[PDB]
Amino acid sequence: AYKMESRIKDISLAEFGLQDMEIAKTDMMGLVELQRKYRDSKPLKGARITGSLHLTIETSVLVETLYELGAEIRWCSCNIYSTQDHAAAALVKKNIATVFAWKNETIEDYWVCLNDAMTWRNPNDKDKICGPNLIVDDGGDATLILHEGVKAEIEYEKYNKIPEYLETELDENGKQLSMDLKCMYKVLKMELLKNPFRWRGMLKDLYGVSEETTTGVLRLKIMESEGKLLLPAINVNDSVTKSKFDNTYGCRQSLLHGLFNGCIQMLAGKKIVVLGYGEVGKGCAQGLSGVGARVIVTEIDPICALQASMEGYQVSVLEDVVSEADIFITATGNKDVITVEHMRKMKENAYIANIGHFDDEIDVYGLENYPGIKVIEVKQNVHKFTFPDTQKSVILLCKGRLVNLGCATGHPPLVMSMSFTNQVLAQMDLWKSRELVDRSKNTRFFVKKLSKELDEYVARLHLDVLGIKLTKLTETQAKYINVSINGPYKSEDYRY
Amino acid sequence: ESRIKDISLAEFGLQDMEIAKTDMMGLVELQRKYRDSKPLKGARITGSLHLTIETSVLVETLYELGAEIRWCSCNIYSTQDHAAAALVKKNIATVFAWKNETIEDYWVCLNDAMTWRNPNKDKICGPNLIVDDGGDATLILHEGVKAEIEYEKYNKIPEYLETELDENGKQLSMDLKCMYKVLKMELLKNPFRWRGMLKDLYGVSEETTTGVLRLKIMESEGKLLLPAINVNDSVTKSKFDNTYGCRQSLLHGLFNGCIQMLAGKKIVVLGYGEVGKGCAQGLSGVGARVIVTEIDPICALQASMEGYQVSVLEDVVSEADIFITATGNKDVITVEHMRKMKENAYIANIGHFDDEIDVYGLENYPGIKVIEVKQNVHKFTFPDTQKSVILLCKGRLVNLGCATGHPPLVMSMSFTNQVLAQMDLWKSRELVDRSKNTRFFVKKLSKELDEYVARLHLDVLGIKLTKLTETQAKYINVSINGPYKSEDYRY
Amino acid sequence: YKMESRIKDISLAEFGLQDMEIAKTDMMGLVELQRKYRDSKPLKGARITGSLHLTIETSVLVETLYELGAEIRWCSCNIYSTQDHAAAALVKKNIATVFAWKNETIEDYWVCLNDAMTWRNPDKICGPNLIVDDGGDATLILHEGVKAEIEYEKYNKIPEYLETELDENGKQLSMDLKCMYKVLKMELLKNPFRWRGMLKDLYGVSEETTTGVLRLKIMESEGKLLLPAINVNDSVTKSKFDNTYGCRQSLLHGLFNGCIQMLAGKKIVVLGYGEVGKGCAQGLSGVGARVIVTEIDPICALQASMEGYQVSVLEDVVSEADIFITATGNKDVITVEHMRKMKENAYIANIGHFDDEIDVYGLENYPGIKVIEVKQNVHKFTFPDTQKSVILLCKGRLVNLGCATGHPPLVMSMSFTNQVLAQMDLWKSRELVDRSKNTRFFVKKLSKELDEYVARLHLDVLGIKLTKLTETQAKYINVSINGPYKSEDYRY
Amino acid sequence: MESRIKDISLAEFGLQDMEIAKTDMMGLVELQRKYRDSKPLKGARITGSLHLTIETSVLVETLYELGAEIRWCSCNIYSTQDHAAAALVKKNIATVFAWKNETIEDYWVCLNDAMTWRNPKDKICGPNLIVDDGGDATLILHEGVKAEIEYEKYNKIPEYLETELDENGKQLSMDLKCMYKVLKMELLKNPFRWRGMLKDLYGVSEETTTGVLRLKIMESEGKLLLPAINVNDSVTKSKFDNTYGCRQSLLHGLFNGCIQMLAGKKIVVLGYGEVGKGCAQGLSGVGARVIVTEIDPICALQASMEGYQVSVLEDVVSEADIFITATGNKDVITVEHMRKMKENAYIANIGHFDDEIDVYGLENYPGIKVIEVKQNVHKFTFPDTQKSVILLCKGRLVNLGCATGHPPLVMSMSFTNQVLAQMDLWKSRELVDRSKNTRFFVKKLSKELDEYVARLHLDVLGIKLTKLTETQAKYINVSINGPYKSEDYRY
Numbered sequence A: 001a002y003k004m005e006s007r008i009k010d011i012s013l014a015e016f017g018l019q020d021m022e023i024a025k026t027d028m029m030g031l032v033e034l035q036r037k038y039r040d041s042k043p044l045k046g047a048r049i050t051g052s053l054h055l056t057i058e059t060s061v062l063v064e065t066l067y068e069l070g071a072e073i074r075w076c077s078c079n080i081y082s083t084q085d086h087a088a089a090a091l092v093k094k095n096i097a098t099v100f101a102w103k104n105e106t107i108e109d110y111w112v113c114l115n116d117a118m119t120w121r122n123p124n125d126k127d128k129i130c131g132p133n134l135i136v137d138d139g140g141d142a143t144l145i146l147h148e149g150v151k152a153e154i155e156y157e158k159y160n161k162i163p164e165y166l167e168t169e170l171d172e173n174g175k176q177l178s179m180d181l182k183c184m185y186k187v188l189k190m191e192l193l194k195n196p197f198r199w200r201g202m203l204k205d206l207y208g209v210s211e212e213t214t215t216g217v218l219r220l221k222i223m224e225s226e227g228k229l230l231l232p233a234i235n236v237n238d239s240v241t242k243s244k245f246d247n248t249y250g251c252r253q254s255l256l257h258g259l260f261n262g263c264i265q266m267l268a269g270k271k272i273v274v275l276g277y278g279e280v281g282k283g284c285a286q287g288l289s290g291v292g293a294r295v296i297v298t299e300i301d302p303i304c305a306l307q308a309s310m311e312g313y314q315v316s317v318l319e320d321v322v323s324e325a326d327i328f329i330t331a332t333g334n335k336d337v338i339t340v341e342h343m344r345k346m347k348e349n350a351y352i353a354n355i356g357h358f359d360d361e362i363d364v365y366g367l368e369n370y371p372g373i374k375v376i377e378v379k380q381n382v383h384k385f386t387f388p389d390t391q392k393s394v395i396l397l398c399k400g401r402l403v404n405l406g407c408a409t410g411h412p413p414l415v416m417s418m419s420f421t422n423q424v425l426a427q428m429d430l431w432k433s434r435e436l437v438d439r440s441k442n443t444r445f446f447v448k449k450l451s452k453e454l455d456e457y458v459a460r461l462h463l464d465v466l467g468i469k470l471t472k473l474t475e476t477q478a479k480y481i482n483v484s485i486n487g488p489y490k491s492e493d494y495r496y
Numbered sequence B: 001e002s003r004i005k006d007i008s009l010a011e012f013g014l015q016d017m018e019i020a021k022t023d024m025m026g027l028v029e030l031q032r033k034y035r036d037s038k039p040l041k042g043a044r045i046t047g048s049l050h051l052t053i054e055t056s057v058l059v060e061t062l063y064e065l066g067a068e069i070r071w072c073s074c075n076i077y078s079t080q081d082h083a084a085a086a087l088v089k090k091n092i093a094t095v096f097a098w099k100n101e102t103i104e105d106y107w108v109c110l111n112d113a114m115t116w117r118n119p120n121k122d123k124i125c126g127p128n129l130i131v132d133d134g135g136d137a138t139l140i141l142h143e144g145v146k147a148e149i150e151y152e153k154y155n156k157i158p159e160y161l162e163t164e165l166d167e168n169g170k171q172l173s174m175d176l177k178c179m180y181k182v183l184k185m186e187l188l189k190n191p192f193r194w195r196g197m198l199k200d201l202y203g204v205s206e207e208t209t210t211g212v213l214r215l216k217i218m219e220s221e222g223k224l225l226l227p228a229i230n231v232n233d234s235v236t237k238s239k240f241d242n243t244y245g246c247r248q249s250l251l252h253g254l255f256n257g258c259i260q261m262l263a264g265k266k267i268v269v270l271g272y273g274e275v276g277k278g279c280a281q282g283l284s285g286v287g288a289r290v291i292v293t294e295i296d297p298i299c300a301l302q303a304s305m306e307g308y309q310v311s312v313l314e315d316v317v318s319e320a321d322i323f324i325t326a327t328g329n330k331d332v333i334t335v336e337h338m339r340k341m342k343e344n345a346y347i348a349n350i351g352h353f354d355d356e357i358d359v360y361g362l363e364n365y366p367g368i369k370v371i372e373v374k375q376n377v378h379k380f381t382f383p384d385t386q387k388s389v390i391l392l393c394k395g396r397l398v399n400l401g402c403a404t405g406h407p408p409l410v411m412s413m414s415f416t417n418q419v420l421a422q423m424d425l426w427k428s429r430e431l432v433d434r435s436k437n438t439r440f441f442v443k444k445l446s447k448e449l450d451e452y453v454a455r456l457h458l459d460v461l462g463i464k465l466t467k468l469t470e471t472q473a474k475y476i477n478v479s480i481n482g483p484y485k486s487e488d489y490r491y
Numbered sequence C: 001y002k003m004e005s006r007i008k009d010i011s012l013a014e015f016g017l018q019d020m021e022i023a024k025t026d027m028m029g030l031v032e033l034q035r036k037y038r039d040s041k042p043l044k045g046a047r048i049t050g051s052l053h054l055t056i057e058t059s060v061l062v063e064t065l066y067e068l069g070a071e072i073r074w075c076s077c078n079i080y081s082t083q084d085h086a087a088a089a090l091v092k093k094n095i096a097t098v099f100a101w102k103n104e105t106i107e108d109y110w111v112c113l114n115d116a117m118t119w120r121n122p123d124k125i126c127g128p129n130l131i132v133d134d135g136g137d138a139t140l141i142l143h144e145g146v147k148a149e150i151e152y153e154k155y156n157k158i159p160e161y162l163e164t165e166l167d168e169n170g171k172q173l174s175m176d177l178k179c180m181y182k183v184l185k186m187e188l189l190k191n192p193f194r195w196r197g198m199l200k201d202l203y204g205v206s207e208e209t210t211t212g213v214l215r216l217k218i219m220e221s222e223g224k225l226l227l228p229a230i231n232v233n234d235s236v237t238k239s240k241f242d243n244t245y246g247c248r249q250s251l252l253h254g255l256f257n258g259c260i261q262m263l264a265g266k267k268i269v270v271l272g273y274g275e276v277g278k279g280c281a282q283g284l285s286g287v288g289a290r291v292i293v294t295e296i297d298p299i300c301a302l303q304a305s306m307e308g309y310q311v312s313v314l315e316d317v318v319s320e321a322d323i324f325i326t327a328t329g330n331k332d333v334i335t336v337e338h339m340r341k342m343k344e345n346a347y348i349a350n351i352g353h354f355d356d357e358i359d360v361y362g363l364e365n366y367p368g369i370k371v372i373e374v375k376q377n378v379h380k381f382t383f384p385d386t387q388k389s390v391i392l393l394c395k396g397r398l399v400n401l402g403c404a405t406g407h408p409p410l411v412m413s414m415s416f417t418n419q420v421l422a423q424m425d426l427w428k429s430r431e432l433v434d435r436s437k438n439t440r441f442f443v444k445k446l447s448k449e450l451d452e453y454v455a456r457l458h459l460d461v462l463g464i465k466l467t468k469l470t471e472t473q474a475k476y477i478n479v480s481i482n483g484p485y486k487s488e489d490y491r492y
Numbered sequence D: 001m002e003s004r005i006k007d008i009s010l011a012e013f014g015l016q017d018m019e020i021a022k023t024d025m026m027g028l029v030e031l032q033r034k035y036r037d038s039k040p041l042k043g044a045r046i047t048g049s050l051h052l053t054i055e056t057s058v059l060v061e062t063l064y065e066l067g068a069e070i071r072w073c074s075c076n077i078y079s080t081q082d083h084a085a086a087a088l089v090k091k092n093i094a095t096v097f098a099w100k101n102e103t104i105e106d107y108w109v110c111l112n113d114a115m116t117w118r119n120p121k122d123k124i125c126g127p128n129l130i131v132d133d134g135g136d137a138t139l140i141l142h143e144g145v146k147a148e149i150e151y152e153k154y155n156k157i158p159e160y161l162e163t164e165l166d167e168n169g170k171q172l173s174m175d176l177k178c179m180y181k182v183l184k185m186e187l188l189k190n191p192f193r194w195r196g197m198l199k200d201l202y203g204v205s206e207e208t209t210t211g212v213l214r215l216k217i218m219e220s221e222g223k224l225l226l227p228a229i230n231v232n233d234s235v236t237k238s239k240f241d242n243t244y245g246c247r248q249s250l251l252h253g254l255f256n257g258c259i260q261m262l263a264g265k266k267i268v269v270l271g272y273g274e275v276g277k278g279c280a281q282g283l284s285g286v287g288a289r290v291i292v293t294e295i296d297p298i299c300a301l302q303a304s305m306e307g308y309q310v311s312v313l314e315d316v317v318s319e320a321d322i323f324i325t326a327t328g329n330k331d332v333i334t335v336e337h338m339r340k341m342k343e344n345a346y347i348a349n350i351g352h353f354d355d356e357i358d359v360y361g362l363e364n365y366p367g368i369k370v371i372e373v374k375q376n377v378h379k380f381t382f383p384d385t386q387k388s389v390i391l392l393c394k395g396r397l398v399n400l401g402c403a404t405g406h407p408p409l410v411m412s413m414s415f416t417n418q419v420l421a422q423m424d425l426w427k428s429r430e431l432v433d434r435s436k437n438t439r440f441f442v443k444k445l446s447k448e449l450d451e452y453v454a455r456l457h458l459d460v461l462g463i464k465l466t467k468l469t470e471t472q473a474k475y476i477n478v479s480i481n482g483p484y485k486s487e488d489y490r491y
């Protein structure tokens, strides 16, 4: 059953994925504990969960946890390069989930996989389609195809024809559409022809989405402020045990791993530009400095810029260092931070990489389609581009996709367990509150965060991994600082 | 009227103020922008905050903006006498502060700073605004009001003021007994003093974590008697002063009071909050092996991610070499702990109050011998083991007691927030209705102002900020001019 | 070259050639040596045999020797360290005859080394004129070969020690010795004057690493060294850069590829705090690990402490630590008994030259041990009695080259510029080697002038601007404006 | 009393600091314990010229317990700790000629007096052994001999002792004029003084890089007049004192003399040798952005490998905030450089002599204005630009002039080498034959002793060494007890 419907690269890798999962679980104590405590009561029993999140070994442990808790699951990855084929195979082999994911997907396949992951067959038999009850999302793509799908269906009935914005390769402004929008639109058009009630029909059983990353949260907030959010949402990124660990310490290690795999050069002594000094940029700079690089930071936020200066880093505008720096790393979550014009001024064999969620940070399309550009494959997912007029070259890591997952295996299990423990608690919260979702009276939906009590609990579940011994307050001390002995220990606005 | 150690020290203080101002851009800019319009014109401001060179620049700023000023320090050891002299010499403020005050004189200085006179018939008023660090000015006001209400309740001095024991049986701290002694003295002179100050009080802007805690407790109990602004929780304060300020000033305090090498030593940092994080970073920067204690599992994990062992004090007390309390809590290092420490272990506190260390218990231990090693450094020897521990400045904040506190740059960021806070409180004075509400709250400054403080300090360090294009601003959903982050952003 | 080389796949050549060109952006010492000496050819006609990890960095070294006039035969000095695309690039361009591939058996390793040492003159066999050695295996086979020939002639039979699985005490010989011995036995049957015959034309060996230098010094002290030697490891621009900063980066690369776990907050034991250990520790702390050092040398131990690292004996932390990295160059540093006390899924790896640091043989042969392959060159071992497991990276072979790609080009260029200079020195003095009279050879090092020159060649890579002394300043500190700037005993 | 010190009443404070210091100075404590009964230096007359700090007072005490008679002076006008000097005199441990803030004239008079011993009746002798730091004691001896020979050759005072201008005619340093004034006086008083000392002089042990260079120059020219031991190049000295000592004591000096925050500042470290490496590490540890200058391409690459920009001073003199000289060279910061610096740039030197900075040129610049900011910190303002620079302690080693120098642990390592070096020279005295050979050399202590010094300090830091098995010892070809490294090993 699961093996026939799933689409993965190679089931024979299952045994290696299972063995890696067991090793990873030594450190993923949060997920191990949730399984231990809830596998028998099954709090998610009956829930249909669709996930769009990098299908790595760490993610396979998250999926296993959701399955042990009672959920039926369909999964896909949220990046064309981030899937670990042995991880995917492990899930299918054990019948833990129906999977549509493989490393090195085409953009078209990415959107077909996501769409298939959102498709559930009616538990009341026959050719009837349903949607998921809950969504685990990373970057907002599952949430995007749902909202855009609803928008397309309304537009479709209004003029009783395929909306023309779906049949054009051009933007409202005039420029060409990203390959991602063209592929999503192609899937949506196809669905308008199969069943133009598919998307609105899913709303009936949709109880929520838990969003993993900064960029996904930004998308959610924009929908919320415009009154367009169609389901309840939990912002997992902003849990303290997520944003202050995964984003920073995870990147401190996995950026280095991606660079070491993709870039042959020594980092020590090099001028390395980290564009953006937020949670991710802070971790990146720390790792880079740790191996002797001279980090130069760019920022638009005066506070973050001052923080960088306090760690001994030069803070400059890209234009003043573009011809002198050796390596450029984008960590902004923004777009057009490195343009083709910037790339033409870089020194011979400068390296460029992106660690933000989307490739838009770097003008990869402009680079690849520059007239007379010459490209060679240096190794898998590493390309050297040579301009025709100057004959100078730049080297780009994995077509500007998130380098730690494209050119390496992503963050290690410990921090992913902290982020994923938050995901499981978020999913449990949304599922338990499903009766409060009434699609007739209650039309307006919101984004919330998990409580500080749960945030502290996530941390407690990982202390033993590191042999950390926590101090206990006496009654006198607890009263003196005005906190309960069991916490929470900090006010809501505390920044850690 | 001022009470300071020596006015002849003024020229050194004035000279130090000018040098410091090179990096205190925020204060220099507020003086340039507002010395003519004078947004604080006529406000009576009482400050209770370490009177350092950095603080004298803050005082000069409030003065140039139009305020009348009375000032005292919030610690018996933190005043820099040359800074105090500079303010009196220039007649910028009336000062009651000196280095090495007795606890009795501390509370007399505070009480005098809160008293305003001249033909206003010819009697006592209170301040309009308070700049507070640790909450002592705010405490004496609230405890004063409480004392006056108890006084009229039974037409006699409240008995809790005339005892040496607390609501339990233990000795009251010397600070508490000296405050009560002042309140009793004021009930006899004028039992309407404290409540009389309320009609003119428009707010307090609180500098530190411990003072904010005090304010939040009063707020949750509905006992806050004036509007308050929490300056500690501005991003440009808590994430810079508390962290990077301590990273440098802790080391300075340790170098001045502890003769030993920090490299290789096991140094226990108790508390890994904003202060503790800065402390650990500076200690490691000079080769120490930092060991952390924490009650908060999130903070404990953060310490572990920086490569530090996280342990309970009882497991490392007999092996570690130096102990630094940074908790804002009480009884973190007890006399029983000190009796198990190795020979010549060093003990210091960087939290706001001395209560973190059981100094009273140590000083009153039967047969204890004490020797003064240098100014404000004492070696205590237990008579049974003959072992000694060395305590820096009687457990008072070591960076201000054994050194000169944080450097100008981070203080300018903290103090630019203070000036903006005072301006907010003063401009809104007409909104304070006493006869009606009597329900006050603690608020913070906006992110717009927080970002502004940072902008004012970028040129000091040659930082070049990038400008978003319209397309980029739209993409990340922010205005080109900020704010650039959501309210819950943690930096 | 294609006709005789033994490599994995010639088709990988173009990837090797592209990587070499990218690498050359930073290997400016080798680039400058080629520019300056490709016409004069200071090594013209020299037959050079190399036994050194055949990486992309090594390919640039080999290309440099070739442009300088040498004929070359090469093999790797570890079964796991060859980069197949690097090997293919050399063969494809006809730069060298190569006997190397990633994942050789120990049998193939020794056969490859023997082939690299065999030069034909078309008929008769010859040896190399010069040897580039890393760890001393090429030097070892020569000396053991000579010893085997002498033993063979006095008793007129194959020496008994070459025909047994055991040493003099009844203990099992290492696989490396058995395989070396089987090669020497074969050569005695083909030509019992092979090894001795090579001495005539041998002018020297330049040794890359600490462990190999130890081997040379022992031979020198016993009066058994059969050729001049240059110790490259102890050039300042080698030992203070490659060994420390190279490992700071490549240890981490090796751990990231082989060990799935997060390094931050883990107790990571670095056994040995010499030039390698210092670099390992710095890299590990750089990513948040809590480093614990073991040492036998009180000076090195004190240095670790000054950097904030706990210094303990292995027995006191073996049950609590998470990861163990051996960087000693010694043996039996991690025994089977230590491994039986480790926590579940503890990781073990070696960064020293030889696998001897960890008792891999005892672990693999432990009665009832269960072994599972986690990924290429990473194995999980489970003890039958406790049911606890340990995870060994690349069977105890140097982890930065076995599980990753070794040091990056910049530091290798510095080490390799020294190697080329050493080779030139030995070849230029070939006429002064007298086999008849002076049969006593020594180990020497390159001059401080050449050492400073190596550093000068790499300054522009990192945009370093060097200050120039005024004539008055030069007098004051008593140095020449052009150096050397430091005493011979200066430790940098 | 024959001794000349600031104040004997400070002795008690000095004695208590010595006892606290001893907790970490294990090497000196162990030498006292082991050799005080047998007294291996009994009868030796030792003259020391080395910064008279609390740490140095423990070295002197050690030589004294070992049987030596002692006379001492400091090797810098600002480095003496008066309580340390007082402690030695109070206990009769040594005759001392030292105080903090000496004039240059008094410095040379103190050194000359330290070199003068009485003959047991009314005549003088010299020392048997010299402990030197920077080579001034060694310098006055050789220049003394040279002046006596020159005096007898032409039956008059050598005119170079009365010129005021040097051989080139560019004005002698104040240090040279004062030394020459002493030598002129001693020629008129006893023209055989210096040569008469050679008889009983058995050696000098030199502490620092600059002093060793001076020894090496004399050795190479065949002019060295006594055996010498290079203590600086022991591994347990140069790799610990010079690097980790400065990492901490540079910061202490800067925090005391410079009010500004180091974080984010561009700080230039000129010279990246043993001292510079430690300075850079300390500065980075508190958030500074370190920029290095170097003449040695190897040292330059090392700096780059730690992430530091490496530039020539001319390319950064106008943008940098603070300048620290650690070269041991001269004229690395000229008056012309200082004129290009930004407003309130700070300048300091941590090398042995003040020559690294052109202090004479600055102080004598026509129309320069100078103000004392605090004790030993001066702000110089140029008349044409009205820009100012702030110089710490007139260019003298900042860690000892503006602070208390290195801490006890590393000084104990350096001083344990000194005692062993003194014991070596003393035990070899019969090999010094004036009539027979007359060519002397510089040597170093053995690696066995170098390792012993390290072993003596392991327990201070809780270090647990591993012991080699017999198989392992044979495998790496070393004795179980060491030494563990070849002679050329660089650590």
Ligand SMILES: NC(=O)c1ccc[n+]([C@@H]2O[C@H](COP(=O)([O-])OP(=O)(O)OC[C@H]3O[C@@H](n4cnc5c(N)ncnc54)[C@H](O)[C@@H]3O)[C@@H](O)[C@H]2O)c1
Residues within 6 Å of the ligand: C467, C469, C473, C485, D208, D209, D210, D211, D241, D242, D246, D270, D271, D272, D273, D274, D275, D276, D293, D294, D295, D296, D299, D326, D327, D328, D329, D332, D350, D351, D352, D353, D397, D398, D399, D400, D406
């Ligand atoms: N203040 C202290 O407590 C203390 C302690 C130890 C040594 N020292 C003194 O510090 C000085 C340096 O000692 P060290 O042991 O580091 O010597 P070192 O030889 O190890 O380092 C000096 C470095 O300065 C560099 N240099 C020389 N001239 C230069 C110039 N014009 N510009 C840039 N760089 C230049 C050299 O290349 C060298 O690397 C000496 O005078 C020594 O006596 C002082």
Ligand SMILES: Nc1ncnc2c1ncn2C[C@@H](O)[C@@H](O)C(=O)O
Residues within 6 Å of the ligand: D050, D051, D052, D053, D054, D055, D056, D133, D207, D208, D209, D241, D242, D245, D249, D352, D400, D404, D405, D406, D407, D411, D414
């Ligand atoms: N506390 C101190 N007492 C005596 N001398 C000190 C001290 N600190 C530095 N030096 C100078 C030493 O570093 C010396 O070894 C040197 O080389 O200058």
Ligand SMILES: [Cl-]
Residues within 6 Å of the ligand: B394
């Ligand atoms: Cl007290």
Ligand SMILES: [Cl-]
Residues within 6 Å of the ligand: B039, B426, B427
């Ligand atoms: Cl107003």
Ligand SMILES: [Cl-]
Residues within 6 Å of the ligand: C221, C222, C223
């Ligand atoms: Cl012999």
Ligand SMILES: [Cl-]
Residues within 6 Å of the ligand: C395
């Ligand atoms: Cl094997």
